Each structure stands twice: as structure tokens, then as C-alpha cells.
Design a protein that fits this description.
- The chain has 537 residues and is mainly alpha-helical.
- Among the domains are: 96-243 and 251-325, no CATH class; 429-533.
- It has helices spanning 4-20, 31-45, 64-76, 80-83, 85-106, 108-120, 122-128, 133-151, 158-179, 182-197, 203-206, 209-230, 234-240, 255-261, 269-276, 282-298, 311-324, 328-348, 362-389, 394-415, 417-424, 429-433, 452-456, 470-475, 484-493, 503-509, and strands at 52-53, 56-57, 442-445, 461-463, 498-501, 516-520, 525-528.
- It has a five-stranded mixed sheet. A two-stranded antiparallel ribbon has the order 1-2.
- Helix 15 (269-276) packs across helix 17.
- The longest helix has 28 residues, at 362-389.
- The chain is globular, with a radius of gyration of 25 Å.
- Bound molecules: [(Z)-octadec-9-enyl] (2R)-2,3-bis(oxidanyl)propanoate (3 copies), phosphocholine, chloride ion (2 copies) and zinc ion.
- The site of zinc ion has 4 residues, from loops.
- One of its GO terms (molecular function) is metal ion binding.
- It is a multi-pass membrane protein.
- Residues 61-225 form the Glycosyltransferase RgtA/B/C/D-like domain.
- The chain crosses the membrane at residues 1-20, 85-102, 108-128, 164-197, 209-227, 251-269, 283-300, 306-323, 335-355, 367-386, 398-415.
Length: 537
């Protein structure tokens, strides 16, 4: 316990950056806003069974992420960092259990390398600070893998093996309550593939199959029964609905995602392979985890980046052992390569200053470019001081390097606030809230705004195409305007209300109905049907 004062320092500096950075960006739609708002509505209603999005049934996802977010709301009230609490705790959880399994099978030093690996991995840290279900599922599934590895260690008693096995099945249950059957399909897949490569059938006896299935059913079934009974249309939807938004992604879709999301360790990607090929083989289990899940999502029709996040913890374990075998000169090689590519990021950072996308003007991206450049600069600093610390050992150099990378990608994420804040609509929320009341409708005229209703603490009344709310709009049609043509009669003859639409929608409806503009930004026009709810015009 000589240099423990460094570790305590390191982790401390990590944790404060881990949580403070949560509350420094406005919510980025659709995901962050969608789950923050669903959780808000659950929090305000108390109905933890029937998930609703803008007062409409939302049966596209299971509720565990929302349960966690709602507990967070009850403890610390509504806000940005509270809405991102589930994913941050999921990230810490993946780090923790990952280096627990690493410490069990490969020792303390390798476990430290695993924690550093997951910390520096931009996919794990970014995804850990971005409110989406993929990081929650990644943390609970990392509990599946880690608990499975803990339970298969020979030096554990039958009581410990059963404890880690029921812990594994329980984690699979939570995962099913997080994003559906994936939480059990991917493990089983990774399981059978394993038993085909190693030809160890007796492993199916160590799983505690009966007890684990029973405890998993006890965890998952109650909510599914409740929501299926209260809403008979739920099971056919959740298990049959082919969801799609506005697919067609190549089989190489997740290749730049996995490479970029594990970038500070890309140079040792071969040394990860030579980590698994070289009774129970844990590194091989992690490798079959990452590879099997990767090829599973790579051959799937629907592809989203977050799908691939659950492979990162396993990679972390592999990284932990690979870095554990490196001499000082080899890590020097890695530092040289990463210094090169980070310097290329610094030279290429002005590229984003020439961007304008998602109806966000170029200026915000000019302000993003300086933050990206700063990010690669702090990466370079961390690399330099790591090279200075290489004389004291590989582990301190890797620790400083990983800290530099983590702070770097953290700066790169916080810099996204430049383009995320004008899109969130939080700026024009106070202007709207001055005249908008909770009993007033806020029509969404063919626009599913994912962030503004959260900031208004006020749900949208969907008008016309409800997008992913279509299903909800059809099973409870008394809560929704079916088409814009009915919205015109509601608008000219109904109660005083407001409406959110796109600018092109405003110009399309302008010759039809006169509307007084309450607020505008680059992505939305907010109007009222009475002149007294807006500024002079
Ligand atoms: C022997 C030691 C047994 C330790 C058991 C740990 C139980 C953790 C279960 C958590 C399930 C999902 C967490 C998210
Ligand atoms: C005709 C009606 C078809 C309705 C499909 C319901 C599917 C239920 C899935 C149960 C999950 C077990 C795993
Ligand atoms: C965020 C969690 C990451 C935890 C990683 C702990 C690594 C500690 C590194 C200290 C270096 C000591 C050199 C001797
Ligand atoms: C996306 N969805 C929830 C509508 C269908 C997916 O369900 P499942 O793959 O968990 O069975
Ligand atoms: Cl509220
Ligand atoms: Cl701004
Ligand atoms: Zn859908």
C-alpha cells in the first residue's frame, strides 16, 4: 500500500469527472430525450407497468431503464444528469464486475489494466454518459459475463458457484427487462458457440439450469404478465412488431464502430486474439462473447451503433490480459502509434468546422471544431506524460495514458453541446412556458419532438403521423388528432392551444390557418391559435 495515494487520487479524479460531465450537456434527441421524458411521465403518474411516451402507450422497449431513471428522479428531481444516471451507473458497473472477473482469473495487475481499458475506451465512456438503453443493457450483460466467469472458477466452492450462477441468471433477467429477449439470446448463443469450440458439454451441468431458469422467470415474468393483462395488445406488439425508422446497412457496419469505440487499444487488437487462443477457458469465453455478438448484430437487418456496446466489457477483459504481458518497449510502440493517430486527429479537427448537418448551421460546428482539437490535444498531453512515466513501469504509463484518453473523449463529448443545445429546444422553452399551461394542449403537427416536451414538463398531443407513437395513437384515438385536416378545425374552433411543427410544416399550413408565432429555433416553430399567447405580430 505504498503508492495507494495515487490510486485513490486517480479513481477520485475519474469519478468526479464521471458524474460532473453528466450535467454539462442538454438532452440530445431522440434517445436521451425519449427515455428522459418517458421516465418523467412514469414518475409523474406512478404507473410503472404501462409505459407511456407523450401520454401514449409505448411498447417498443421494456421498462427497467425507466424504473432506474424514475428512482433517480425520486431521489434527485428532474434534470439532465438525473436522466443520464442509469447509463452512468451501468458504465461503472461494467468496469467493476469486469475487473472483478479479471482479478479472479488473471490477478490484480490484469484487473487494473481492465479497468483502465474500459475507462479509456470511448464507446464505453461516451455510451456511459449518453442516455440510451444500450449502455444499461451493456452493464447488466457485463454482469452476465462476469458472474458466469466467477461461477466457473475451480477454486470456488459449490455455494460460491451456485451464488454466481443465480447471480448470472438474475442478470439475464434484468437484461430481458431492459431490452427484451436479447439478454438471453446472445448469452445462450455465446454459450453454445463456446461448447462447440471447446467441446465441453459438462459445462451445462455447472449452470444451475433449473434454479437459474426459475429465478429468471421470477424476475422477468411479473411485469410481462401485468402489462399483458392490463393491455391485451402488448404481447403481439412487443414480440411481433417489426420496428423501423427513417435499415439497409452493410455487413461491415459495426467494423469502424468497434475500431473507433476501442481506439486507444486498436494497436493491441492482435494481442487480444493471442489472448484467447492461448478446464474452463475464461479469455476464450470473452473472445467468443465479443466475436459472436459482433457477427450477430453484423448480419442483422436493423443496425444501430449501440447494439455493439455489450462487446466492450469482454474486450476490456482481453485488453487487461494483453496489456498485462507487455514489456516497456511494446507499450512504447503503442504510445508512438497512438501519438501519431491522435496528432492526425488534431490536424483533421478543422474538418468538422466545415460541417452543417441535421438543420444546424455551420457556426455551431465551428465552435465544435475547437473542442475536438482540444480533445486531441489533451490526448497528446496524456500520451506525452505517459511516455515520461514509462521509466517507472508499464502499469503507471498505461494508467496515465488511459486517463488522458478518457479526459480527451470526455472533452469531445462535452463539445457536442455546441450543436446539441440549439437542437434540444431548451433555450426557447422558457419563452413558451411563460404562456403554456398544463391544461393547454401542445399539438405536435407531424413532428415528434423528443426534447422540448421534457424541458416544458408537458406532453405533446400528436397530430397526424405519430412516427413511433403511431401504435399508441391508434389504440387510444381519443388522445390524438388523427390528421392535420381535423387539427385545423380544432385549431380555429377548439380551445386555445399551442403547436410545435417544422418550418416547412408552418409554411405548408400558413395559407390554411393563421397562427401567431410563440417561439422559433433552427428545428422548430412554436405557435398559438390566439394572439394573446404570443409576442406582438
Ligand atoms: C458468492 C457471492 C455471490 C454474490 C451474488 C451477487 C448478486 C448480484 C445480482 C444482481 C443482478 C443484476 C445486477 C444489475
Ligand atoms: C396469434 C397470436 C400470436 C401472439 C404472439 C405472442 C408471443 C408470446 C411470446 C412469449 C415469450 C416466450 C419466450
Ligand atoms: C474508473 C475506474 C478505473 C480504475 C482503474 C484503477 C487503476 C489505478 C492506476 C494506479 C497506477 C499505480 C502505479 C503503481
Ligand atoms: C422492437 N420490438 C420490441 C418491437 C420487437 C423486439 O422484441 P424481441 O426481439 O425482444 O422479441
Ligand atoms: Cl414532472
Ligand atoms: Cl446556443
Ligand atoms: Zn415500432
Amino acid at each position: 500500500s505504498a503508492a495507494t495515494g495515487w490510486v485513490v487520487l486517480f479513481v477520485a479524479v475519474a469519478l468526479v469527472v464521471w458524474f460532473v460531465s453528466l450535467d454539462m450537456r442538454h438532452l440530445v434527441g431522440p434517445d436521451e430525450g425519449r427515455y428522459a421524458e418517458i421516465s418523467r411521465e412514469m414518475f409523474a403518474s406512478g404507473d410503472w407497468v404501462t409505459i407511456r411516451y407523450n401520454a401514449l402507450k409505448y411498447f417498443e422497449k421494456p421498462p427497467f431503464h425507466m424504473w432506474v431513471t424514475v428512482v433517480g428522479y425520486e431521489l434527485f428531481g428532474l434534470g439532465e444528469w438525473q436522466a443520464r444516471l442509469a447509463v452512468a451507473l451501468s458504465g461503472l458497473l461494467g468496469i467493476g464486475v469486469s475487473m472483478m472477473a479479471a482479478r479472479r482469473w488473471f490477478g490484480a495487475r490484469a484487473a487494473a489494466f481492465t479497468g483502465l481499458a474500459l475507462l479509456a475506451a470511448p464507446m464505453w465512456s461516451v455510451a456511459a454518459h449518453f442516455n440510451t438503453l444500450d449502455m444499461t443493457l451493456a452493464g447488466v450483460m457485463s454482469c452476465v459475463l462476469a458472474f458466469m466467469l466467477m461461477g466457473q472458477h475451480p477454486d470456488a466452492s459449490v455455494a460460491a458457484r451456485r451464488g454466481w450462477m443465480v447471480a448470472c441468471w438474475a442478470a439475464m433477467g434484468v437484461a430481458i427487462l431492459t431490452k427484451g429477449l436479447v439478454g438471453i439470446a446472445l448469452p445462450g448463443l455465446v454459450l453454445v458457440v463456446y461448447t462447440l469450440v471447446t467441446r465441453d458439454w459438462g459445462l451445462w451441468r455447472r449452470l444451475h439450469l433449473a434454479l437459474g431458469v426459475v429465478v429468471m422467470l421470477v424476475i422477468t415474468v411479473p411485469w410481462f404478465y401485468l402489462v399483458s393483462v392490463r393491455n391485451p395488445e402488448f404481447p403481439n406488439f412487443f414480440f411481433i412488431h417489426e420496428h423501423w425508422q427513417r435499415r439497409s446497412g452493410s455487413v461491415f457496419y459495426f467494423l469502424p464502430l468497434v475500431i473507433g469505440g476501442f481506439l486507444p487499444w486498436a494497436g493491441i487488437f492482435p494481442k487480444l486474439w493471442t489472448a484467447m487462443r492461448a478446464r474452463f477457458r475464461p479469455a476464450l469465453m470473452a473472445g467468443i462473447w465479443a466475436i459472436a455478438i459482433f457477427v450477430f448484430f453484423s448480419i442483422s437487418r436493423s443496425k444501430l451503433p449501440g447494439y455493439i456496446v455489450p462487446v466492450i466489457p469482454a474486450l476490456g477483459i482481453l485488453a487487461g490480459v494483453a496489456l498485462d504481458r507487455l514489456s516497456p518497449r511494446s507499450w512504447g510502440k503503442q504510445l508512438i502509434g497512438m501519438a501519431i493517430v491522435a496528432a492526425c486527429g488534431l490536424l483533421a479537427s478543422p474538418v468538422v468546422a466545415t460541417l452543417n448537418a441535421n438543420h444546424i448551421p455551420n457556426s455551431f460546428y465551428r465552435a465544435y471544431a475547437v473542442w475536438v482539437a482540444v480533445a486531441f490535444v489533451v490526448m497528446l498531453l496524456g500520451i506525452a506524460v505517459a511516455r515520461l512515466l514509462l521509466r517507472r513501469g508499464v502499469l503507471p504509463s498505461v494508467a496515465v495514458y488511459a486517463m488522458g484518453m478518457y479526459l480527451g473523449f470526455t472533452v469531445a463529448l462535452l463539445g457536442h453541446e455546441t450543436v446539441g443545445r440549439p437542437a434540444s429546444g431548451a433555450d426557447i422553452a422558457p419563452q413558451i412556458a411563460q404562456k403554456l399551461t398544463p391544461e393547454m394542449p401542445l399539438y405536435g403537427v407531424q413532428m415528434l419532438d423528443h426534447t422540448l416536451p421534457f424541458y416544458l414538463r408537458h406532453p405533446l398531443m400528436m397530430v397526424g403521423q405519430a412516427d413511433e407513437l403511431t401504435f399508441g395513437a391508434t389504440v387510444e384515438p381519443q388522445r390524438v388528432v388523427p390528421d392535420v385536416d381535423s387539427f385545423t378545425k380544432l385549431w380555429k374552433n377548439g380551445q386555445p392551444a399551442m403547436a410545435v411543427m417544422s418550418p416547412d410544416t408552418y409554411l405548408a399550413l400558413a395559407p390554411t390557418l393563421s397562427m401567431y408565432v410563440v417561439a422559433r429555433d433552427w428545428r422548430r416553430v412554436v405557435v398559438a391559435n390566439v394572439a394573446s399567447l404570443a409576442g406582438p405580430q
